[PDB]
Amino acid sequence: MITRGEFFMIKEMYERGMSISDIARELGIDRKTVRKYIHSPNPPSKSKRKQRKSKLDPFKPYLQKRMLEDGVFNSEKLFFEIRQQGYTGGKTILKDYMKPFRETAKKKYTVRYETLPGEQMQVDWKEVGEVVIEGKKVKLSLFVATLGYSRMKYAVFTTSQDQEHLMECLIQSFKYFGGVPKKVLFDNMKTVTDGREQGVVKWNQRFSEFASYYGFIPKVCRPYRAQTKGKVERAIQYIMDHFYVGTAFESIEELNFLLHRWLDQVANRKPNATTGISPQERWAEESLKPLPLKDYDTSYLSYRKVHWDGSFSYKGEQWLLSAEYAGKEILVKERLNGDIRLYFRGEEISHV
Amino acid sequence: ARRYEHAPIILTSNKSFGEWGEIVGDSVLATAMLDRLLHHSIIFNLKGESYRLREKRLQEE
Amino acid sequence: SKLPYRKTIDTFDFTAQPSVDERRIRELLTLSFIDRKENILFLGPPGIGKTHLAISIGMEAI
DNA sequence: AGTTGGCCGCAGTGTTATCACTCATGGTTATGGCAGCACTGCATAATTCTCTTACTGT
Ligand SMILES: Nc1ncnc2c1ncn2[C@@H]1O[C@H](COP(=O)(O)OP(=O)(O)O)[C@@H](O)[C@H]1O
Numbered sequence: 001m002i003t004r005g006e007f008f009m010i011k012e013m014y015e016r017g018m019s020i021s022d023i024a025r026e027l028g029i030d031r032k033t034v035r036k037y038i039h040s041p042n043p044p045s046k047s048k049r050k051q052r053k054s055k056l057d058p059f060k061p062y063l064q065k066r067m068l069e070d071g072v073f074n075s076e077k078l079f080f081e082i083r084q085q086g087y088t089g090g091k092t093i094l095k096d097y098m099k100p101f102r103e104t105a106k107k108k109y110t111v112r113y114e115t116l117p118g119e120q121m122q123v124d125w126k127e128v129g130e131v132v133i134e135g136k137k138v139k140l141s142l143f144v145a146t147l148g149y150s151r152m153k154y155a156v157f158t159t160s161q162d163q164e165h166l167m168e169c170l171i172q173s174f175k176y177f178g179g180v181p182k183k184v185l186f187d188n189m190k191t192v193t194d195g196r197e198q199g200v201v202k203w204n205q206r207f208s209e210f211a212s213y214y215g216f217i218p219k220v221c222r223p224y225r226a227q228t229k230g231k232v233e234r235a236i237q238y239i240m241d242h243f244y245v246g247t248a249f250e251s252i253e254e255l256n257f258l259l260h261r262w263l264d265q266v267a268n269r270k271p272n273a274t275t276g277i278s279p280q281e282r283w284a285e286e287s288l289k290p291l292p293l294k295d296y297d298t299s300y301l302s303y304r305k306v307h308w309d310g311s312f313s314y315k316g317e318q319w320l321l322s323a324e325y326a327g328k329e330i331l332v333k334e335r336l337n338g339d340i341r342l343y344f345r346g347e348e349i350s351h352v
Numbered sequence: 353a354r355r356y357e358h359a360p361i362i363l364t365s366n367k368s369f370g371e372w373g374e375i376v377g378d379s380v381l382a383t384a385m386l387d388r389l390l391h392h393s394i395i396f397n398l399k400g401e402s403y404r405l406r407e408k409r410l411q412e413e
Numbered sequence: 414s415k416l417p418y419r420k421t422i423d424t425f426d427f428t429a430q431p432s433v434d435e436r437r438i439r440e441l442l443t444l445s446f447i448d449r450k451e452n453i454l455f456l457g458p459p460g461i462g463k464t465h466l467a468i469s470i471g472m473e474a475i
Numbered sequence: 476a477g478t479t480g481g482c483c484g485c486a487g488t489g490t491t492a493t494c495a496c497t498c499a500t501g502g503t504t505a506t507g508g509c510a511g512c513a514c515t516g517c518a519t520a521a522t523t524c525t526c527t528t529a530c531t532g533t
């Protein structure tokens with residue numbers, strides 16, 4: 001088992017012409033050993049041995065059954081049990097054998113990553129809570145979109161977290177940043193996925209079409225791990241401890257106006273604590289893909305029938321349609337702003 | 353063939369009628385499929401470029 | 414219907430597709446082909462709006 | 476005095492040789508039942524429509 005260096009030295013000194021016996025004398029090795037190593041391929045310094053029997057082998061299946069069906073992980077309890085069965089050794093071997101079965105405590109070290117310019121964006125929601133806006137109880141939610149390289153922040157308040165609202169907020173973010181990223185990171189929302197099909201993710205077909213339309217590649221971090229999108233979560237903490245702490249409002253339009261003004265004043269103006277530069281300069285450094293001229297229409301699409309007289313009803317509303325549109329089927333495109341339009345076989349109805 | 357002369361079929365694809373034999377790996381089978389699917393039909397051929405990219409790129413100029 | 418999404422002729426621009434006549438598609442929207450049992454075929458390069466028109470006509474039928 | 480066990484006597488069973496009877500097969504003729512086709516009705520299963528529930532992650 002002469003080590004790498006010893007074997008190299010033996011072979012080299014032997015090939016140099018030095019006599020073998022005095023080589024052995026110099027290196028303090030037996031002459032037979034040195035001579036055998038002369039005609040050897042490479043330094044031998046490794047011995048392979050397979051596993052061997054231990055004391056806790058007969059009890060091992062029983063302990064494994066205890067762990068995997070009774071959920072017992074108390075080394076003292078298992079030791080006391082098996083001691084009656086016949087075991088006589090200490091607990092160290094038991095702990096060593098049982099350690100792999102134990103759950104892996106979550107780490108505390110946190111890797112840091114710096115995405116390339118115009119290469120990544122992050123999105124998330126924040127359930128603000130229930131408020132009485134204009135005498136109406138609604139569930140307010142905050143949508144936050146954080147750029148990855150410039151740390152920009154766009155935000156907007158909404159009353160619902162429907163796929164339509166998500167897509168519209170993404171449109172607003174893309175317009176705000178003057179382009180679309182090459183990658184957009186969400187969490188595992190059903191408006192973007194439909195579960196992990198054996199490790200792989202199954203994208204919602206409509207959302208996949210939307211992404212292919214705007215060209216941005218979706219990504220999802222992982223189940224029950226929000227660290228991977230720390231930028232946007234920390235931006236949420238920033239906004240909810242700086243803007244929505246004492247600000248008072250009565251209309252969501254007013255709140256959104258105040259939020260945009262606040263962002264453009266301080267949030268996207270104050271230099272970041274890590275990049276140490278105003279986010280707008282980095283934004284100017286960003287290179288996002290151009291937006292399409294026509295935005296992906298995100299509006300509720302329903303089919304309704306006009307009554308005999310010509311009175312058409314949608315939600316708690318009523319219209320008066322010409323007699324030619326009575327008893328037929330029409331399309332009611334409801335934009336998220338409340339602009340309802342009526343269509344009949346492509347044509348647009350001048351609804352009264 | 354079962355839907356032939358019974359119900360309409362809406363087909364959409366980007367491969368010419370000659371490539372069907374290659375796609376299905378059979379010449380006469382594709383020929384018969386097309387003979388039945390094209391008997392009573394209205395074929396629309398769309399000539400242009402990919403909207404999402406080309407149209408926006410050429411109209412933003 | 415198992416459509417991947419919902420679209421209609423309203424969101425379709427015939428100026429970007431001037432090669433084919435607009436009137437024929439409007440006629441198809443009358444669903445006269447369902448009685449004649451004629452088959453409707455859309456052929457063109459990728460991304461030119463084939464599936465959009467097909468799904469729009471399917472929506473009109475539904 | 477009664478019940479059970481043992482011994483004796485009687486009856487039943489097994490093997491070998493012999494005898495008798497019944498059943499099976501083949502050929503011809505006659506009769507009855509079953510099978511096939513057409514039409515109608517009922518029930519069950521499958522399909523369609525509507526509503527509710529389930530699963531996973533935030
Ligand atoms: N003429 C058009 N007008 C409006 N939108 C269009 C048009 N052509 C394509 N699109 C958009 O492109 C998408 C349709 O592409 P599609 O025809 O499905 O390509 P493919 O047939 O290769 O799947 C839709 O999202 C649609 O909004």
Ligand SMILES: [Mg+2]
Nearest residue numbers: 124125187533
């Ligand atoms: Mg979230």
